[PDB]
Design an enzyme around this catalytic site. Structure first.
Site, PDB file in Angstrom:
ATOM      1  CG  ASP A 101     -28.174 -11.170   3.444  1.00  0.00           C
ATOM      2  OD1 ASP A 101     -28.454 -12.201   4.091  1.00  0.00           O
ATOM      3  OD2 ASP A 101     -28.716 -10.854   2.367  1.00  0.00           O
ATOM      4  CD  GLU A 150     -25.503 -15.877   4.538  1.00  0.00           C
ATOM      5  OE1 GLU A 150     -25.756 -15.129   3.564  1.00  0.00           O
ATOM      6  OE2 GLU A 150     -26.285 -16.755   4.940  1.00  0.00           O
ATOM      7  CG  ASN A 159     -27.570 -19.139  10.341  1.00  0.00           C
ATOM      8  OD1 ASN A 159     -28.307 -20.117  10.143  1.00  0.00           O
ATOM      9  ND2 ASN A 159     -27.137 -18.361   9.359  1.00  0.00           N
ATOM     10  NE  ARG A 176     -24.414 -15.466  14.357  1.00  0.00           N
ATOM     11  CZ  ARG A 176     -24.405 -15.487  13.025  1.00  0.00           C
ATOM     12  NH1 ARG A 176     -24.327 -14.344  12.336  1.00  0.00           N
ATOM     13  NH2 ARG A 176     -24.470 -16.648  12.388  1.00  0.00           N
TER      14      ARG A 176
END
Ligand SMILES: OC[C@H]1O[C@H](O[C@H]2[C@H](O)[C@@H](O)[C@@H](O[C@H]3[C@H](O)[C@@H](O)[C@@H](O[C@H]4[C@H](O)[C@@H](O)[C@@H](O[C@H]5[C@H](O)[C@@H](O)[C@@H](O[C@H]6[C@H](O)[C@@H](O)[C@@H](O)O[C@@H]6CO)O[C@@H]5CO)O[C@@H]4CO)O[C@@H]3CO)O[C@@H]2CO)[C@H](O)[C@@H](O)[C@@H]1O
Ligand SMILES: OC[C@H]1O[C@H](O[C@H]2[C@H](O)[C@@H](O)[C@@H](O[C@H]3[C@H](O)[C@@H](O)[C@@H](O[C@H]4[C@H](O)[C@@H](O)[C@@H](O[C@H]5[C@H](O)[C@@H](O)[C@@H](O[C@H]6[C@H](O)[C@@H](O)[C@@H](O)O[C@@H]6CO)O[C@@H]5CO)O[C@@H]4CO)O[C@@H]3CO)O[C@@H]2CO)[C@H](O)[C@@H](O)[C@@H]1O
Ligand SMILES: OC[C@H]1O[C@H](O[C@H]2[C@H](O)[C@@H](O)[C@@H](O[C@H]3[C@H](O)[C@@H](O)[C@@H](O[C@H]4[C@H](O)[C@@H](O)[C@@H](O)O[C@@H]4CO)O[C@@H]3CO)O[C@@H]2CO)[C@H](O)[C@@H](O)[C@@H]1O
Ligand SMILES: OC[C@H]1O[C@H](O[C@H]2[C@H](O)[C@@H](O)[C@@H](O[C@H]3[C@H](O)[C@@H](O)[C@@H](O[C@H]4[C@H](O)[C@@H](O)[C@@H](O)O[C@@H]4CO)O[C@@H]3CO)O[C@@H]2CO)[C@H](O)[C@@H](O)[C@@H]1O
Ligand SMILES: OC[C@H]1O[C@H](O[C@H]2[C@H](O)[C@@H](O)[C@@H](O)O[C@@H]2CO)[C@H](O)[C@@H](O)[C@@H]1O
Ligand SMILES: [Ca+2]
Ligand SMILES: [Cl-]
EC number: 3.2.1.1
Length: 496
Positions: A197, A233, A298, A337
């Protein structure tokens, strides 16, 4: 760090956003393993602030209180039970590691935390870790507010507070070690890797120092010497001083251009056309395919957070969304993803969703069970996009065509396109305002093929459209522009 460590032949992961550990553990055994999914990105599994203004938002999980494995998704025993059962059926777990920061500097001191740990943001005291004042970057940051003011300045993006979040002093060996202790705890339980993150707000060298301290993956499930999969990220749309390529030494990076460009193409905004997807990939300015984690939406940008803007497609635009996900899953660029969401009372005022904060389905904060309906969809307001036939069968498509070259491209100069994957799969799209009826070269062996978008192959039969490939690899395709799903896909394992 670049290899996902999935079981061979499994090529995607699914973000089971805000799901509970018991629900994910069951989902591995009843669905993810039999349907060939590679793994699950879980929500952050470490204790966070219980935020009641507003009421338990999804984003309270990005405000850590400690590294105890104790959240609304479950306690440590349930997390362990999940990772073990998922690994036991060949489905990996990837942890959303929130390691750049603790909670908001303005949160009230007390025990309003998901494990009841005491924490004091004003005084920088997180005794359950323990962290104290000299573990944050108050003295490093040079901005007037102490928060990040200007993203054209790479140093303040790293040392100052992302929207007020207390910024860990990731230079210190003690903070690096406390984070590494948390991550090694996860790895030994059996996680296959991590989403890092807010990686843009950490120095690539600090990240490296942390990863240097990590174990190899649990040798009960992974070959000896396996390293954890790392995707960072980094929101890099260009025009900023920080480049996602600066993180290639630590692992893969999220490629947020992917979903923004693809959504613009599929919405046919800005003059874009599917015929332009012929050189999709690095030809569009994206990172190298072997460093890309790709996705259509996302958990942030499906609700206007983060970045990606108006073009992002989500389950709310289901018909276009299935087309975007299908294109992504058929195309060889990147590691895929798939998003799995919940519905919230989305309510736009002036183009802003004033309920973009709403957390998972819940009664008074207790997260609702993911129920499974008779038609294999989910109840209790879990969207379960990964259970939509058109998405799940494309996840299988990607497995079946793994390693085959992009080939046999076709376009009509507008929004009708097709392409194959070696001799194992073929996909056809009609996003123009008229119908598509053409005989195309498919690269496939002759036979009868179930279209896995409109139906399934089940014991010698198709439940949806059938496609007939001749001995020359040609087949006829017929897609009306008013089709519910205006695309068709066939592959080696949908052949009768
Ligand atoms: O027991 C009673 C006790 O209560 C308080 O201390 C507790 C504290 O509130 C609590 O947070 C935790 O303390 C943690 C601490 O939070 C962690 O940050 C960690 O501390 C380590 C530190 O992060 C490392 O960088 C390293 O510290 C170095 C320093 O970098 C050096 O500057 C130097 O420190 C001296 C400094 O130069 C002087 O300015 C002066 O202020 O005194 C300092 C002491 O020499 O050397 C140290 C080398 O140690 O190492 C730290 C320890 O590993 O870990 C702490 C332990 O958990 O728990 C504390 C104890 O309960 C209260 O502050 C205390 O006064 C009180 O005695
Ligand atoms: O404490 C007082 C404080 O109040 C305000 O801040 C609070 C804020 O209003 C509140 O919503 C919450 O903040 C949430 C946040 O809304 C969530 O989006 C979430 O953010 C995390 C996210 O899930 C992560 O994926 C990750 O996203 C980051 C990116 O990593 C960043 O790079 C950055 O993206 C920027 C991008 O880099 C640029 O290229 C450009 O596109 O601009 C982008 C800005 O979006 O930001 C996103 C944020 O989504 O990092 C996040 C942290 O894990 O979680 C947050 C925490 O709950 O809490 C805030 C503080 O309590 C007010 O803003 C403050 O000024 C005030 O000091
Ligand atoms: O749920 C509907 C709407 O709610 C969300 O925004 C809300 C907040 O959730 C409410 O709590 C409230 O916010 C007030 C707050 O209650 C009030 O205490 C005060 O906050 C002080 C704070 O207590 C103080 O300690 C210090 O931190 O300064 C703060 C103020 O600067 O002021 C808040 C509002 O300014 O009202 C808002 C608005 O309804 C949600 O995010 C909305 O999108 C949603 O529509
Ligand atoms: O005060 C904080 C509390 O934190 C923990 O809570 C306990 C509860 O007090 C118990 O009542 C129970 O929670 C029940 C819950 O009451 C019940 O409604 C139901 O909750 C969900 C359910 O989990 C879910 O499957 C969904 O589908 O529907 C329900 C909500 O509508 O089931 C819960 C048990 O699963 O157990 C929790 C903790 O397990 C803490 O343990 C307490 O000490 C404390 O009071
Ligand atoms: O590499 C870890 C390290 O990075 C930063 O140091 C940088 C600095 O920001 C650059 O501007 C220049 O000085 O080179 C250094 C090495 O790349 C952080 O300041 C530091 O805290 C961090 O540990
Ligand atoms: Ca930082
Ligand atoms: Cl992400």
């Amino acid at each position: 760090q670049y290899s996902p460590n999935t079981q061979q032949g499994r090529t995607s992961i699914v973000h089971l956003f805000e799901w509970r550990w018991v629900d994910i553990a069951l989902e591995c055994e009843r669905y993810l393993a039999p349907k060939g999914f590679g793994g699950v990105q879980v929500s952050p599994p470490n204790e966070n602030v219980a935020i009641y203004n507003p009421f338990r938002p999804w984003w309270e999980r990005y405000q850590p209180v400690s590294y105890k494995l104790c959240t609304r998704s479950g306690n440590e025993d349930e997390f362990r039970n999940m990772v073990t059962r998922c690994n036991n059926v060949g489905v990996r777990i990837y942890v959303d590691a929130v390691i750049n920061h603790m909670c908001g500097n303005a949160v009230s001191a007390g025990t309003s935390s998901t494990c009841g740990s005491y924490f004091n943001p004003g005084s920088r005291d997180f005794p359950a870790v323990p962290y104290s004042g000299w573990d944050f970057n108050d003295g490093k940051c040079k901005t007037g507010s102490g928060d990040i003011e200007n993203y054209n300045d790479a140093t303040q993006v790293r040392d100052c507070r992302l929207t007020g979040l207390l910024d860990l002093a990731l230079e210190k060996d003690y903070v690096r070690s406390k984070i590494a202790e948390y991550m090694n705890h996860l790895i030994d339980i059996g996680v296959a890797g991590f989403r890092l993150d807010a990686s843009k707000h950490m120095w690539p060298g600090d990240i490296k120092a942390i990863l240097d301290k990590l174990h190899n993956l649990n040798s009960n499930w992974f070959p000896a010497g396996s390293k954890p999969f790392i995707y960072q990220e980094v929101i890099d749309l260009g025009g900023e001083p920080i480049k996602s390529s600066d993180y290639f030494g630590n692992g893969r990076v999220t490629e947020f251009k992917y979903g923004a460009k693809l959504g613009t193409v599929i919405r046919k905004w800005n003059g874009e056309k599917m015929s332009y997807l012929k050189n999709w990939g690095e030809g569009w300015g994206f990172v190298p395919s072997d460093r890309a984690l790709v996705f259509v939406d996302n958990h942030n940008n499906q609700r206007g957070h983060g970045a990606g803007g108006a073009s992002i497609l989500t389950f709310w635009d289901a018909r276009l969304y299935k087309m975007a996900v299908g294109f992504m899953l058929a195309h060889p660029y990147g590691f895929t993803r798939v998003m799995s969401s919940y519905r919230w009372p989305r309510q736009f005022q002036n183009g802003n969703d004033v309920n973009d904060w709403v957390g998972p389905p819940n009664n008074n904060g207790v997260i609702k069970e993911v129920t499974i309906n008779p038609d294999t969809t989910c109840g209790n307001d879990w969207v379960c996009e990964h259970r939509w036939r058109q998405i799940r069968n494309m996840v299988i498509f990607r497995n079946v065509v793994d390693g085959q070259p992009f080939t046999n491209w076709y376009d009509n100069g507008s929004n009708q396109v097709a392409f194959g994957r070696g001799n194992r799969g073929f996909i056809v799209f009609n996003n123009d305002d008229w119908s598509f009826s053409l005989t195309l070269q498919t690269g496939l062996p002759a036979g009868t093929y179930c279209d896995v978008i409109s139906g399934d192959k089940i014991n010698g039969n198709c439940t949806g459209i059938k496609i007939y490939v001749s001995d020359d690899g040609k087949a006829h395709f017929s897609i009306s522009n008013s089709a519910e799903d205006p695309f068709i896909a066939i592959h080696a394992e949908s052949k009768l």
